[PDB]
Amino acid sequence: SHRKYEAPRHGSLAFLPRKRAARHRGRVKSFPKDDPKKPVHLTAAMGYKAGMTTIVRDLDRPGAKAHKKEVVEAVTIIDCPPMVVVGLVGYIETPRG
Amino acid sequence: KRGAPGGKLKMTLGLPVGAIMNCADNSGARNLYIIAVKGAGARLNRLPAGGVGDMVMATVKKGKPELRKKVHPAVIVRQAKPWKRFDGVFLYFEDNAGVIVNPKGEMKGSAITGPVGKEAAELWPRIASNAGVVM
Amino acid sequence: PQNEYIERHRKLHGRRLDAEERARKKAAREGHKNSENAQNLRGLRAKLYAKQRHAQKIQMRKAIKQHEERNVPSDPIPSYLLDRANPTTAARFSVPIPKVRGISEEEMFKVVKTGKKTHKKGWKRIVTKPTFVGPDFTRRPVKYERFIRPMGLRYKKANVTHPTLNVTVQLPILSVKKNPSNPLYTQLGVLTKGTIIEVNVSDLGIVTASGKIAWGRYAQITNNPENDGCVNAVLLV
Amino acid sequence: PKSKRARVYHLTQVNKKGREAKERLFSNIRETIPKYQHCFVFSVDNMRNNYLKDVRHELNDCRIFFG
Amino acid sequence: EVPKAVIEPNRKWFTNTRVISQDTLQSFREAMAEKQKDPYTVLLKSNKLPMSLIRDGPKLEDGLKKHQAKMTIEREPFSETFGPKAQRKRPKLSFNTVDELAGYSEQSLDSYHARLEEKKLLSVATAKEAIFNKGTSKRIWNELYKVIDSSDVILHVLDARDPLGTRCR
Amino acid sequence: MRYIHSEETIPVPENVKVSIKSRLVTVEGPRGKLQKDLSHIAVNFSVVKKGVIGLEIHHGSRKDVAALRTVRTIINNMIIGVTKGFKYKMRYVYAHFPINVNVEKNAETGCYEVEIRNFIGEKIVRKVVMAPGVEVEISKAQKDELILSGNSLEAVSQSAADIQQICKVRNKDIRKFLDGIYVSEKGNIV
Amino acid sequence: TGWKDIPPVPTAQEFIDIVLSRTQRRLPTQIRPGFKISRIRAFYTRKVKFTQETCSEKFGAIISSFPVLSDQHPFHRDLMNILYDADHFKVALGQISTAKNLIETISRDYVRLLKYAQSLYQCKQLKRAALGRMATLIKRLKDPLIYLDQVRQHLARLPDINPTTRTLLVAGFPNVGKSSFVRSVTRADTPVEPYAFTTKSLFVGHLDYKYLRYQVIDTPGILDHPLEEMNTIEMQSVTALAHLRAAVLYFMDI
Amino acid sequence: AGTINKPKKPTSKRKTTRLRAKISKRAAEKKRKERKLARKNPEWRSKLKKDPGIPNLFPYKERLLQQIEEERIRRKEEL
RNA sequence: CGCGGGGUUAAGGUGCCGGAGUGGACGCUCAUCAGACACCACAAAAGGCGUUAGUACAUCUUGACAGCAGGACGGUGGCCAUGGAAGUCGGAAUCCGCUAAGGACUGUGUAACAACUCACCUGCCGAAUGUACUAGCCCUGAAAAUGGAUGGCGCUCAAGCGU
RNA sequence: GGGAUGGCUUGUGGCGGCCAAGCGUUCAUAGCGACGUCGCUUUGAUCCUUCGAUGUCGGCUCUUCCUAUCAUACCGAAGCAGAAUUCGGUAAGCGUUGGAUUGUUCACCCACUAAUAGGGAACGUGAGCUGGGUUUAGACCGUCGUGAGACAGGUUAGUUUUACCCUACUGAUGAACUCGUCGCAAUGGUAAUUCAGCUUAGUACGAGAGGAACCGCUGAUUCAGAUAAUUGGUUUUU
Ligand SMILES: [Mg+2]
């Protein structure tokens, strides 16, 4: 018979299976859609997570309660030494992708 | 219009249903017993709770006798559970206390004993008009 | 606004500019819409729609027949009885229902179980059909009450129809004369179909040939009270 | 043909005339022929013709057919 | 076992089981006229009688206001009173002259003020506690009616400190 | 019942050139050209006479025979569109807030764009893009009138219906709130 | 305030359709003969109780929404008597309350019978009997429901007259300028026309004098005959003159 | 309805043996019952049924009626 | 009904799974989960502006059905009633004239009128139609709860239905 | 020793009379008969009439499904002025709560809320945990019985205690293709939800009381995925 009291699901089925990642480095599943009218640019970069710290921000958010006031926010520092470009891969379109 | 105020930022709720707070005005009541919180959501087994500036429904357990038979709207002006403001300041008061109001937010009493919270003062203009000190 | 303000606005400003043509087009599509409803609705909604449309066709046909026949009391009553609502008014001493479905004792009574052990005593029987217990009734003690006639199934009145006068009156029950299935059922006063009961006919105003007032007569139950919640009877006249 | 226009039954007093009106017109014309000396033919083309009532009233000694 | 449920033809089914004469009816009417109530007498066995012919009729005021509503509806229906096909033109008034209207209006105002004062003399409140509903449950009253159906004598017990308070009318 | 032969005829004016190939009808006149693919209907086209187009169905059911009337009316509407044109006059009416209608012609697409503002005091800007070949003009003879003209009756009437349907009064009594843009006249340009 | 918050009153057939659709669609419908008899009894008892509760809440809304003429100001009481025949008003609401009580009694009787019913067929017959008797009782209310819906619409469109405030009451014969005066001093949209009895109901407008709110009441005209010959249209004006403590402006055309 | 994008549970046309046997048994029982009711039927039935006749759209109906008159006169003369 | 070889059939089948026909003739049906082993129930004299075949009655070049252009009148604002009510809030009557035809009116409308519209008639046009039933096939004619069943794929001048 | 009604059901009563299109019948004018109709079953009252457990349910945790939709989204109609609604349609995407009450069919009250919809997968018997129907042995009271004892009953206390197997599920390795790096994407899963405030605007609308919405802006509720700068908590940093 039915549940006497309704309750939503614990957890999301979108993130199944709850297994270990197949690689240590994160995979870009999708890149932004190419527009040939745009100037040439790169879509991604790498860095190393160093830690986090605290800031004070001077907020300019009209309509908000903390507008023209100071707010304390958490921020994460990513150490980013410059990358080195060493290669070029070409991709064609096929009926299999 | 229900008594839940608009333009309130998220804060740590310190007073669930069943909590007895002090009565900070001179309406005659000495304490307020929470039985409901305005604007509370629906969730299984979760007790409704409110913070400073929230409206609750409270009965009087101790005080003037003709106040003891009704359920009054009240605004929580002080809480003892520490909470954070947007300037990064964590703070708390030494007691939990509220004031009896009507659903329009106007106070039953005429004076407030002790300080009130900035959230309560900014959300209810009559409490800011009847407060002697705002912290 | 006050009083007929929508009518005043209607007079001062008119309609929307497309209202007449729009209603004309909708009334024109109404036939296709009816056919789509007839062929596309499902379930109880479709059944109710079909029944309603059948009724509409019947009254439409009646109206057309009356318009075709445009160009073409029963019993004698006195003038003081004219224009009032009068009833229509329509050896072998056989009852109108000579035979009904027989009721076995297993259907008639159910076993009431007693005791605290897993094995229960089963000597009590509960009467599962409506009964008439009579006046000045006091229930037997529970230690000596084999037959249980529950209070919620007890009846005192019946809707009795007079075949000659064509009137149905609610009358008190005087006694149960004969249950056709069992003399035990007659003794218990069970009110089932085909049962002969005695009814109080004082309200019907029956006077005998000697001038006496007949206030008790016989009726036969013509329904199933256990299924209907009411006792319906016809006077044996 | 299941798909057809629903013919409207008019719940009004006046019915269609039929052949009886034609025979009545025949009999009226054939009985008004021997009673008069002249038979004029007149035309009212692309006209409202509601003044023929006034013409009939003014020529009360004549007979007018407009069938 | 399913029995044969059959009713034989019989002349007794078509006769009058109980009859009464007019003299007997008049005697019983006089008997109820001279009836008095005695607390020290008990009823042991009722007499089967046509009580609708012996009991006196209801009061004329009761018999008139019992039928006033249907009488008004028969005199003038709902559709002729108010609606798109209403034909009502004159109202029903309790006054006939201007002086009667003035007196009726001032009496109506006085009565309205008096009723307002009576209602005035007579935050939301908390719900009544469920303990004060005790003694009114369906199980308890099933028990009471079961005992009443079972018993011939009923001892109604009253506290001597509050007899009319504890009396169950 | 299957009918052996059914025939329809379309007269063609002298200033019209009609080319039908593989049931693709191209109609040319003074006002331009119109094109319609009618390959979803089984029909035989022919020239039965100078200036008459014949339509035949052989061994067709009643439905197939009846479709020829639709084809006849569609081709006649194409002919009327390339000779006289089609014109829909719409009127916008208001009670309190004047309806602000701006008509522009987009450069890269070539279609007209109609912007509607202040409809019952709303701050949103409604924008309707016309079908190609439809010209919209704010009238100067009368007050609060748009004129949509073209060769395609389908395009002109659909653009008029789009303008009519974008300005719907919502959640208000339509007996009291009469605001909107409605088609007032339909006819030919010439 | 007014009387615009009365919920709409359906006809008898619409009432039956609404209640039976609620019973059919807000409860489960599938019961099986092979189930336990307690389960079958619970199913049909729930059907009967839900039907009665829907009827009871609709009837109680109708009863508690309409004005109580015993509790009104005498002006409002006499105005409602002129407009709607207070006798018919009270008879209609009494019929509604009597039907509500009878439906509750039928529900209690058939629930008590369903406590003792022994099979699904008998339970079904008892449930259908209860629902049919309720439908018959609703069908016997055809004319009061139509009358009460009409009265509800008229009450919703009635103007709001405060009987204990500052008020000008304009009276007289027709065609003397009463509505012209009320239009000139207030914002009320009372029509002005040259024919007699243009105004057939009480109209009210408002004005400000020395920072105070005054209400002005335009009335239908009154003719010169005794009150037994006055119709309802003139008796609205007579009621206003008789029960409203006002400043009377009697208009005359010389 | 949203049947195309979101269809519901299909209705099975696959019968079961128990349902087939029950339907056949009930059909045979109904046949026997209507045979019994036809035997005990109280309704009046004509000895000779009302014959529909000759269709109007038959082209030779009139000459057939001419014939029918000819055999009735011939039988009257012979008898 | 012994163990085998060959031949021929019954019931049932021949689009593939599967041996045998995308066999032949004439038709019918398009289903938003058709139908293919149905007969019983739902279920009724049931509802369909689906599609075809019939039966009966009726109109029709003396012009039928549909349309378009016009007429749709006079006694008369018929009687009673109503603050008002003129065909059109109601109650009851419902006739005559002119007629080619027009109701003491079918609806919209007016406070009441006015005005429009319908019934009916004439002009234009042009040849077959209207109504009600019957028989087929198709749709609806009530359904819950894991994802599934004409055995499955699938099949639409069939690989469905009748012979 | 033997055992452990079902293509059922759903929304509209029964009895009695009358009418009745039609079906029959026209050597008998009977009989069936939908649609209906008529009889029985308080002037808004009363509150001094609650009418019988043989049939037993719960609660927790948790997953999914149905739609017969309570709310949210869109649409049709209503004297629907506005506001708030009512009736109905498509729709299961997403939610559907916190408590009191056992001198009792535990069902009804209270509040919060957008709303606090109804069911199935058990109850057409049935090993998760734990309370009532419920009932071994001890004991008491009431009824019956001469008694052993039994019950119309009421009360108290009271023994079942797997998993390491197969499968399913959740995770984790992995042989064969030399090892490794960078990738593709068949298929399976899939995610967000509701309210409030500022503005529009005291504007449209309204006699008055009152009183919206689109676009734009800012927060919060429920859910989901992460994280430890800060604040709390935790201390075998012994
Ligand atoms: Mg005037």
Tab-separated table of C-alpha atoms and ligand atoms in Angstrom, chain G residues 174-176 191-199, ligand 1:
chain	number	residue	atom	x	y	z
G	174	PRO	CA	-38.844	61.452	-11.456
G	175	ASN	CA	-37.385	63.888	-14.000
G	176	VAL	CA	-36.585	66.633	-11.459
G	191	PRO	CA	-27.584	57.704	-15.623
G	192	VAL	CA	-29.364	60.957	-16.477
G	193	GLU	CA	-32.197	60.578	-18.990
G	194	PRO	CA	-35.368	62.543	-19.824
G	195	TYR	CA	-37.814	59.663	-19.192
G	196	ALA	CA	-39.384	58.796	-15.852
G	197	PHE	CA	-37.889	56.100	-13.588
G	198	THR	CA	-34.490	56.091	-15.272
G	199	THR	CA	-32.984	55.236	-11.881
K	1	MG	MG	-34.863	60.943	-15.772
